[PDB]
């Protein structure tokens, strides 16, 4: 029993140079066997005779999606971690500057929402992936959807301050 | 306002509050400058409150916020409206000695 | 009769008093969330509000 | 009436010992001096245990069932308390200074570090009856060479890991069969080992010492025999570790130093999560929640208590009390909070139910001598030794007025007008009374005529006549208002301290230095009657003095007295450890309360143990301060002839026990006494003490519920009033329907009127049935509100408790629904377009 | 300080100081101690001070 | 002295035998009744921003830099009962059907069944940070369903005359959080009708107002004069 994760040709060279830190938790912590098909540009994970294949698939799928090495190891460990993918889909007007509104100047809005909601976000052209806990993904996604659908920067930043406080608060 | 209290959504005569509806930014900002300084009394405050009321219900609230100068006025005369609200609420709570006198006058027989 | 008409007049004036309180603080609050500033960090936020507060100086006795 | 019990201990959130949380960490248990306070932090309330150690307590633990507590004092007298019944189960004397006590996680054993022996006893049941000897010893291990500083149980209650002053730490199995798994000792520290903890899986052992090293011990090979794998250091140079704890589940090491700084680390990687400071005094206690989210720190020098959540960097509470330095108290005009004027120069406003301080005020640069409320809880006046009276708005929290004289004197007592135009204050070095207007700030008058220091001032609350009384053995009555300038001097037998004034202003009760409380008619200036109180005063013997408690003249008089609000009783306290209350018609002692049994305070024992009196001096006047482990308490910086200065380190004697102010509650049948241990709050409660009112043989709970089931509602209500049983009154009260509240409330007899009013008050403060309680209040005030007005002082504490319900829960709810109505009308009536 | 404590705080006070205090405006919630409750939710400046 | 004994006669209404009376939950359905809980929960909800701003330390604590980013989630194995440690149970809106929260799922199911009793039970259950964090995230963007479901859930709530100070603060928290979008698409039919029937039930709350006005005025007159 096996899984195949297709590595796109824009995350291929980081996979090869950081490959030597990717396969050791895949081959001794997880006890899988791992091959990298250079023909199909894919990663194959097979099970030996001696429920972790989905964990390894999510590990390399996070790296495939665009999350860094330590972020992917954080997904491989830390059972309470999830990752949500969505396109914008809500062109000059709407597509070419809603993503500029998520980013901001030097990505400071994305950095602010990452630190406020304790997720971390990779923003493609229009493909947003979010790695966090369940409630953390909920709040980061609600704020990202907010500032692609139109909200004032004061409103989204006040909501970010409030969500940081209430997510870290007991009671 | 006194004749509006006399006869009988609308708080002045309707031609007057549409005439206060159709006035521009400079006129409404000076109108609220002097509604601000009328509101500092306990006597002249009601005229100011009803002019603020008809401005609020006949203009656009986002427009009222975006007029430059109308955030140093409304900060100045929110707490006056708060103390007048507490004073009129205290007056209407001490208004029920009439009701206590009625129930004593009914227990008289 | 005095009780009914007097309390009707007093509740009629405090109705528009309360209306104006909530409307004016809505106006101020939507101006604030339109263009107040951008601080997510609470310490820099509280120092920004302390620098932008209203100050008044009073003559005290020690 | 007279059946007061010790309810609460306001002030002093922490004195000495370890903080504990509950298991479901809602309450925290804090060692105040010899009591234990328990503060419920979610249900915002608080209580203090009634029992009392004879010295300051040093160790606290309660098992994680929450069902029983054990508290050990600073020479090993343990007390086991039932935590739910609030009654003490056993008194057990361990013979020497126990450093720590801990229950097991499975509750069934406890262990304690008595000297250099770790002794494990097994816990008696809460369901079993009290025996002569309930504790059955499991074992006592002796492997340390010096005193043990800490215990730690493992997660399974299987091993115990103890840390000593001797530079090691040891692990002991509980039972004998696992003796080979746990026989190692952990050396390598340069100083006292302050803590030794397991990891979550019990594979790593962390040992933290006083000099600042934490060692990670692992069962590895260099066979397998507990190597040390990494030493981490705090590198705090001058400061050193005072308290350590570890939450093993969240891997959180919390460490407090002797400089106020505490750091909290994520331990096996040793990454500083946070570092911040309580203050400048050392952190004596760190304790952690069961989920590891709250950290409670206690510093013992200023008596302060933090609980702090480290995720959301925020203080759940940051409180600080006052040991021994509290000059005055004043109830708020509804009995919800008490204002405390304290000798370090500050005002503190303590909530009574939740035992915490809401606001504090530091604008006096010296010891605040008196506080007094005015303008019905809106303004509060205080006078201090720095020469100033000053006024405090309790809305905007601003000192808006400051009154000085012209002569540079220090003020010792004050009195305000009822109609608060004028404040008045008297000194102990000036013989005048200073009369200031409050509206303007000026000095309106200086009343003269005493030939001795004006000890006490009070304005009559009804006719507004001023009564001052001074050490020239004279009470004096000044008619200030309206063209009189009239003075009436009443002489009395000895020099007066603590005048007090009736609520109707008819009479004045003075306390004298003879030991008596004399009561005078004001208008016809002749004595109505006196109480002779100097023979029902408990005056203890100090350690330093060479004269018996019988022949002493130190404290056989009352320096503070206060009327009850029906005018019928006087509570009184002084520089002695008895507070006494009397009923002024009969001039007889109702009840006397022993305010402390702490032998760490001075004037507690009347008879001192003759074993402690040696061939040269007593053994408690010997200062063993250089036998101390570090310099900051080997230091003696106590300048010699200092009495009642500040900074308890600067006085060299034991703190004497004394009550500095007594006051009755304006709303509910209690009194507060400002002792040295804190604000002792004594209150009755009607749940216990069957005290009927003219019942006959046919008046019975069975008869009351038959009358309720047969729906004679008025007869059921008056049967429950004649029972005077709180559950029965509540049952009938809730069973009467809304249709006939006014018929019952109009047909209530006039002798049961204060009972139903004070019941409705003490019920409706916390009950949820807000419209039901307001219907009953409306029906009672409408049906019988003329009897109340012509009998004011009977319903003077039952009506103040009712308008403690209307303005404090019902008006807050009405404010919320009013704001919702007006925001609705705005949000739908106006124009939002773009 | 130590002369007052030695004198057992019977002293004669400092003469007079008409000082000068600046108070910013803020909620009196924020002007309080750290505890779960509060006592007053006003603003520290009067309407005639704003 | 440690337990309570039954005053029931030996020879040779269990609350009345044990001398207690557990106060019943509400006396009549036409009577307003607060929550069975602390009185301070209303004030904590209404002002929890300024209370926490008070509760912050005066300067920022000294952390490290090589601190793990998922420190709140990286526990071990006394379990945390917050809104952050909440797992989903068991095709793109703000919350998919695999990633629906418990509050949003119960709100939707109550919008199906027209009975929000379980929603209101969850609301009265959880803590003020959780309440603010659930009300502040309520899909105020394209068709406005979750706002209007919350509003007529509060309508069904304060029709029942229980927990009503909490339902009042939940409406205040709604108007505070995103009453600006309700003011924005004012005259929208669904949200205007939801506010209309909320006012239809809420306008019968002045019983409490003139009841406390009578009690305050007459109590003051009787005590002073």
From Swiss-Prot, chain C:
Domain of life: Eukaryota
Subcellular location: Nucleus, Nucleolus
Function: Involved in nucleolar processing of pre-18S ribosomal RNA.
More about this protein: Present with 9620 molecules/cell in log phase SD medium.
Family, per entry: Belongs to the WD repeat WDR3/UTP12 family.
Oligomer status and interactors: Interacts with snoRNA U3. Interacts with MPP10. Component of the ribosomal small subunit (SSU) processome composed of at least 40 protein subunits and snoRNA U3.
Protein name: U3 small nucleolar RNA-associated protein 12
Organism of provenance: Saccharomyces cerevisiae (strain ATCC 204508 / S288c) (Baker's yeast)
Swiss-Prot record, chain D:
Positions of the UniProt region annotated as Disordered: 631-652
Gene Ontology biological process terms in this record: endonucleolytic cleavage in 5'-ETS of tricistronic rRNA transcript (SSU-rRNA, 5.8S rRNA, LSU-rRNA); endonucleolytic cleavage in ITS1 to separate SSU-rRNA from 5.8S rRNA and LSU-rRNA from tricistronic rRNA transcript (SSU-rRNA, 5.8S rRNA, LSU-rRNA); endonucleolytic cleavage to generate mature 5'-end of SSU-rRNA from (SSU-rRNA, 5.8S rRNA, LSU-rRNA); establishment of cell polarity; maturation of SSU-rRNA; maturation of SSU-rRNA from tricistronic rRNA transcript (SSU-rRNA, 5.8S rRNA, LSU-rRNA); ribosomal small subunit assembly; septum digestion after cytokinesis
Alphabetically ordered keywords of this record: Nucleus, Phosphoprotein, Repeat, Ribonucleoprotein, Ribosome biogenesis, rRNA processing, WD repeat
Residue numbers carrying Phosphoserine: 629, 642
Family matches, as Gene3D superfamilies: YVTN repeat-like/Quinoprotein amine dehydrogenase
Any GO molecular function: mRNA binding
Signal peptide boundaries: none
InterPro entries the UniProt entry points to: Apc4-like_WD40_dom, G-protein_beta_WD-40_rep, PWP2, Quinoprotein_ADH-like_sf, SSU_processome_Utp12, WD40/YVTN_repeat-like_dom_sf, WD40_repeat_CS, WD40_repeat_dom_sf
Pfam families on file: ANAPC4_WD40, Utp12, WD40
Role according to the record: Required for bud-site selection and cell separation. Also involved in nucleolar processing of pre-18S ribosomal RNA.
Misc. comment: Present with 16700 molecules/cell in log phase SD medium.
Record PANTHER family: PERIODIC TRYPTOPHAN PROTEIN 2 HOMOLOG, WD40 REPEAT PROTEIN
Name of the protein described by the UniProt record: Periodic tryptophan protein 2
Curated annotation (Swiss-Prot), chain E:
Function, in words: Involved in nucleolar processing of pre-18S ribosomal RNA. Required for the early cleavages at sites A0, A1 and A2 during 18S ribosomal pre-RNA processing.
The family this protein is said to belong to: Belongs to the MPP10 family.
Complex and partners: Component of a heterotrimeric complex containing IMP3, IMP4 and MPP10. Interacts with snoRNA U3. Component of the ribosomal small subunit (SSU) processome composed of at least 40 protein subunits and snoRNA U3. Interacts with the SSU processome subunits EMG1, IMP3, IMP4, KRR1, NOC4/UTP19, NOP1, RPS4A, RPS4B, RPS6A, RPS6B, RPS7A, RPS7B, RPS9A, RPS9B, RPS14A, RPS14B, UTP1-UTP18, UTP20-UTP22 and UTP25.
Origin superkingdom: Eukaryota
Location(s) in or outside the cell: Nucleus, Nucleolus
Official protein name in the record: U3 small nucleolar RNA-associated protein MPP10
Paired cysteines (S-S): none
Shown stretch of the complete protein: 446 to 495 of 593
Organism: Saccharomyces cerevisiae (strain ATCC 204508 / S288c) (Baker's yeast)
This protein's encoding gene: MPP10
UniProtKB/Swiss-Prot annotation, chain F:
Extra facts: Present with 2020 molecules/cell in log phase SD medium.
Annotated GO biological process: maturation of SSU-rRNA; rRNA processing
Residue span relative to the full protein: 659 to 939 of 939
Protein name per Swiss-Prot or TrEMBL: U3 small nucleolar RNA-associated protein 21
Alphabetic keyword roster: Acetylation, Nucleus, Phosphoprotein, Repeat, Ribonucleoprotein, Ribosome biogenesis, rRNA processing, WD repeat
Subunit composition and interactions: Interacts with snoRNA U3. Interacts with MPP10. Interacts (via WD repeats) with UTP18. Component of the ribosomal small subunit (SSU) processome composed of at least 40 protein subunits and snoRNA U3.
Keyword Repeat among UniProt keywords: yes
Organism expressing this protein natively: Saccharomyces cerevisiae (strain ATCC 204508 / S288c)
Residues with PTM Phosphoserine: 78
Function text: Involved in nucleolar processing of pre-18S ribosomal RNA and ribosome assembly.
């Amino acid at each position: 029993e096996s899984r195949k994760i297709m590595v796109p040709p824009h995350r291929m060279t980081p996979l090869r140079n950081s490959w030597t830190k990717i396969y050791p938790p895949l081959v001794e912590h997880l006890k899988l066997q791992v091959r990298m098909n250079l023909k199909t540009k894919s990663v194959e994970l097979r099970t030996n005779p001696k429920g972790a294949l989905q964990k390894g698939a999510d590990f390399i799928k996070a790296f495939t999606l665009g999350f860094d090495l330590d972020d992917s190891i954080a997904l491989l460990r830390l059972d309470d971690l999830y990752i949500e993918t969505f396109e914008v889909k809500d062109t000059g007007d709407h597509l070419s500057r809603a993503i500029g509104r998520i980013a901001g100047k030097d990505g400071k809005t994305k950095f602010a929402i990452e630190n406020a909601t304790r997720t971390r976000i990779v923003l493609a052209d229009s493909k947003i992936h979010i790695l966090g806990g369940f409630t953390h993904i909920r709040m980061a996604r609600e704020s990202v959807v907010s500032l692609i659908l139109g909200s004032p920067p004061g409103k989204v930043y006040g909501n970010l301050r409030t969500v940081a406080s209430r997510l870290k608060e007991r009671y | 306002l006194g004749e509006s209290r006399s006869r009988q959504e609308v708080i002045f005569n309707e031609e007057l509050d549409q005439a206060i509806s159709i006035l521009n930014d400079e006129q409404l900002i000076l109108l609220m400058k002097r509604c601000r300084d009328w509101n500092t009394n306990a006597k002249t405050h009601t005229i100011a409150q009803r002019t603020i009321r008809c401005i609020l219900m006949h203009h656009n609230i986002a427009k009222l916020s975006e007029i430059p100068g109308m955030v140093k006025i409304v900060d100045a005369i929110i707490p006056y409206t708060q103390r007048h609200f507490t004073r009129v609420d205290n007056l209407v709570e001490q208004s029920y000695i009439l009701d206590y006198a009625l129930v004593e006058m009914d227990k008289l027989f | 009769r005095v009780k009914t008409e007097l309390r009707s007049a007093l509740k009629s004036t405090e109705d528009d008093l309360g209306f104006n309180v909530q409307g004016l603080k809505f106006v101020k609050q939507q101006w604030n969330l339109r263009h107040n500033y951008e601080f997510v960090d609470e310490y820099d936020q509280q120092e920004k509000e302390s620098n932008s507060a209203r100050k008044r100086v009073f003559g005290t006795v020690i | 009436k007279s059946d007061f019990k010790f309810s609460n201990l306001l002030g002093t959130v922490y004195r000495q010992g370890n903080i504990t949380f509950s298991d479901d960490g809602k309450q925290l248990l804090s060692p105040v001096g010899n009591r234990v306070s328990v503060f419920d932090l979610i249900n915002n309330k608080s209580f203090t245990f009634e029992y009392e150690h004879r010295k300051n307590i040093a160790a606290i633990d309660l098992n994680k069932q929450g069902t029983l507590l054990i508290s050990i004092d600073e020479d090993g007298r343990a007390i086991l308390v039932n935590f739910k019944a609030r009654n003490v189960l056993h008194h057990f004397n361990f013979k020497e200074k126990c450093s720590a006590v801990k229950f097991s996680p499975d509750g069934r054993l406890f262990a304690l570090a008595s000297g250099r022996f770790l002794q494990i006893w097994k816990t008696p049941d809460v369901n079993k009856d009290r025996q002569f000897a309930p504790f059955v010893r499991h074992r006592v291990h002796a492997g340390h060479f010096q005193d043990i500083t800490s215990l730690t149980w493992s997660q399974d209650s299987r091993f115990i890991l103890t840390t000593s002053k001797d530079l090691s730490a040891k692990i002991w199995s509980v039972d004998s069969e696992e003796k080979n798994l746990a026989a190692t000792t952990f050396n390598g520290h340069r100083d006292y080992v302050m803590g030794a903890f397991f990891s979550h899986d019990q594979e790593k052992i962390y040992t933290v010492s006083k000099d600042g090293a934490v060692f990670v011990w692992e069962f590895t090979k260099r066979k397998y025999s507990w190597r040390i794998t990494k030493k981490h250091f705090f590198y705090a140079n001058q400061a050193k570790v005072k308290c350590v704890t570890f939450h093993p589940a969240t891997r959180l090491l919390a460490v407090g130093f002797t400089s106020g700084e505490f750091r909290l680390y994520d331990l096996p990687d040793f990454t500083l999560i946070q570092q911040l400071s309580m203050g400048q005094n050392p952190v004596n206690t760190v304790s952690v929640n069961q989920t590891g989210e709250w950290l409670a720190f206690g510093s013992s020098k200023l008596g302060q208590l933090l609980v702090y959540e480290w995720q959301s960097e925020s203080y759940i509470l940051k409180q600080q009390g006052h040991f021994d330095s509290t000059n005055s108290l004043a109830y708020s005009p509804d009995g919800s909070r008490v204002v405390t004027a304290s000798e370090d120069g500050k005002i503190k406003v303590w909530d009574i139910t939740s035992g915490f301080c809401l606001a504090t005020f530091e604008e006096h640069t010296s010891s605040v001598t008196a506080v007094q409320f005015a303008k019905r809880g809106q303004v509060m006046f205080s006078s201090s030794l720095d020469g100033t009276v000053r006024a405090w708005d309790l809305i905007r929290y601003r000192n808006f007025r400051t009154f000085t004289g012209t002569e540079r004197i220090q003020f010792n007592c004050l009195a305000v007008d009822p109609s608060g135009e004028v404040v008045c204050a008297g000194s102990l070095d000036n013989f005048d009374i200073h009369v200031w207007s409050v509206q303007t700030g000026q000095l309106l008058d200086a009343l003269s005529g005493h030939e001795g220091p004006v000890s006490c001032l009070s304005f009559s609350q009804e006719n507004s006549v001023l009564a001052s009384a001074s050490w020239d053995k004279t009470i004096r009555i000044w008619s200030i208002f309206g063209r009189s300038q009239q003075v009436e001097p009443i002489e009395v037998y000895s020099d007066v301290l603590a005048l007090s004034m009736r609520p109707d202003g008819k009479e004045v009760a003075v306390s004298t230095l003879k030991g008596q409380i004399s009561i005078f008619n004001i208008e016809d200036a002749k004595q109505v009657g006196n109480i002779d109180c100097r023979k029902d005063i408990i005056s203890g013997r100090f350690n330093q003095d060479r004269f018996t408690a019988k022949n002493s003249e130190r404290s056989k008089f009352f320096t503070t007295i206060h009327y009850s609000f029906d005018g019928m009783a006087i509570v009184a306290g002084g520089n002695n450890n008895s507070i006494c209350l009397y009923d002024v018609p009969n001039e007889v002692l109702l009840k006397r309360f022993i305010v402390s049994r702490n032998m760490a305070l001075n004037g507690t024992l009347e008879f001192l143990n003759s074993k402690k009196m040696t061939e040269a001096g007593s053994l408690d006047l010997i200062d063993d301060a250089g036998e101390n482990s570090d310099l900051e308490d080997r230091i003696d910086n106590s300048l010699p002839g200092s009495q009642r200065g500040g900074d308890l380190s600067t006085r060299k004697m034991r703190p004497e026990v004394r009550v500095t102010s007594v006051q009755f509650s304006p709303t509910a049948n209690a009194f507060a006494a400002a002792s040295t241990e804190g604000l002792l709050i004594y209150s009755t409660n009607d749940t216990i003490l069957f005290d009927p009112f003219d019942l006959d043989v046919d008046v019975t709970p069975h008869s009351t519920v038959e009358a309720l089931r047969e729906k004679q509602f008025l007869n059921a209500l008056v049967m429950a009033f004649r029972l005077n049983e709180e559950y029965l009154i509540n049952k009938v009260y809730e069973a009467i329907p809304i249709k006939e509240i006014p018929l019952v409330a109009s047909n209530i007899p006039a002798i049961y009127l204060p009972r139903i009013l004070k019941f409705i008050g003490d019920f409706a403060i916390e009950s949820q049935h807000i419209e039901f309680n307001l219907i009953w209040i409306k029906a009672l005030l409408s049906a019988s509100g003329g009897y109340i007005n012509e009998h004011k002082y009977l319903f003077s504490t039952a009506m103040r408790s009712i308008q403690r319900f209307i303005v404090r829960v019902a008006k807050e709810v009405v404010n919320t629904t009013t704001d919702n109505k007006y925001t609705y009308r705005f949000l739908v009536s106006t124009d939002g377009s773009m | 300080y130590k002369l007052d404590v030695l004198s057992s705080v019977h002293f004669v006070p400092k003469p007079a100081s008409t000082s000068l205090e600046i108070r910013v405006e803020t909620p009196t919630i924020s002007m309080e101690d750290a505890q779960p409750l509060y006592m007053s939710n006003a603003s520290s400046l009067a309407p005639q001070e704003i | 002295q440690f337990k309570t004994v039954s005053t029931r006669t030996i020879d040779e209404l269990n609350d009345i035998d044990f001398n207690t009376y557990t106060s019943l939950e509400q006396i009549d359905k036409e009577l307003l009744t607060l929550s069975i809980g602390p009185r301070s929960k209303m004030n904590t909800l209404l002002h929890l921003d300024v209370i926490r701003k008070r509760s912050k330390p005066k300067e920022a604590p000294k952390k490290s830099e090589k601190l793990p980013f998922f420190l709140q989630l990286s526990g071990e194995k006394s379990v945390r009962e917050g809104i952050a440690h909440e797992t989903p149970e068991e095709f793109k809106v703000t919350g998919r059907l695999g990633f629906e929260s418990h509050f949003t799922k119960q709100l939707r199911e109550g919008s199906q069944s027209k009975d929000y009793s379980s929603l209101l039970a969850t609301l009265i259950n959880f803590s003020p940070a959780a309440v603010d964090l659930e009300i502040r995230s309520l899909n105020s963007f394209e068709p406005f369903d979750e706002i209007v479901w919350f509003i007529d859930a509060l309508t069904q709530g304060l029709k029942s005359n229980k927990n009503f100070e909490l339902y009042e603060t939940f409406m205040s928290l709604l108007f505070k959080a995103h009453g600006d979008v309700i003011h924005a698409n004012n005259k929208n039919q669904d949200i205007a009708s939801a506010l209309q029937n909320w006012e239809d039930v809420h306008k019968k709350e002045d019983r409490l107002d003139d009841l406390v006005k009578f009690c305050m005025g007459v109590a003051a007159f009787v005590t002073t004069a």
